[PDB]
């Protein structure tokens, strides 16, 4: 089994992502903000972290930078409603950047790719 930490400030979106990823065969933990995400990730043993960007408190881009710095081989997907940050250099900390879509096929492909 692979374990994924799903980080997003919107509870109904956390819930949706948790359901979608459970269907693909993964075990899912969640965090509601960046600080919680870092606490969970550093103390835990995740295969992949999926990170929203816009959240109250530190942004997902800040979180991605910290994970990359303290876990060199971490697998990180930025999953955000907004394509704005794709050309943001902070986004370079992540392995993949996915804009949220109601069709989850693309996110699932990128997940399967990183968990190879």
Binding site for Mg ion (CB under 5 A): 9, 52, 54-55
Angle between helices 60-70 and 34-43 (to 10 degrees): 20
Known binding residue 9? Answer is yes
CB 38 within 8 A of CB 67: yes
Known binding residue 54? Answer is yes
Question: Per CB under 6 A, does 42 bind ligand BEF?
Answer: no
**Could you tell which of ligand BEF, Mg ion, none binds residue 80, using a CB distance below 5 to 8 A set by kind?**
ligand BEF
At its nearest, how many Å lie between Mg ion and the CB of residue 67?
Answer: 17
Q: Which burial class, exposed, middle or buried, applies to 13 when counting CB atoms under 10 A from its CB (0-12, 13-18, 19+)?
A: middle
- Give, as one character, the DSSP assignment of residue 29: E
Segment interacting with ligand BEF (CB under 6 A) among 18-26, 29-37, 50-58, 106-114: 50-58
């Amino acid at each position: 089994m692979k374990r994924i930490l799903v980080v997003d400030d919107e509870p109904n979106i956390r819930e949706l992502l948790k359901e979608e990823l459970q269907e693909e065969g993964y075990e899912i933990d969640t965090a509601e903000n960046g600080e919680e995400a870092l606490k969970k990730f550093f103390s835990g043993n995740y295969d992949l972290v999926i990170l929203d960007i816009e959240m109250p408190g530190i942004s997902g881009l800040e979180v991605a930078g910290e994970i990359r710095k303290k876990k060199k081989d971490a697998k990180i997907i930025l999953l955000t409603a907004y394509s704005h940050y794709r050309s943001d250099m902070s986004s370079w900390a992540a392995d993949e950047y996915v804009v949220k879509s109601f069709n989850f096929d693309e996110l699932k492909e990128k997940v399967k790719k990183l968990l190879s």
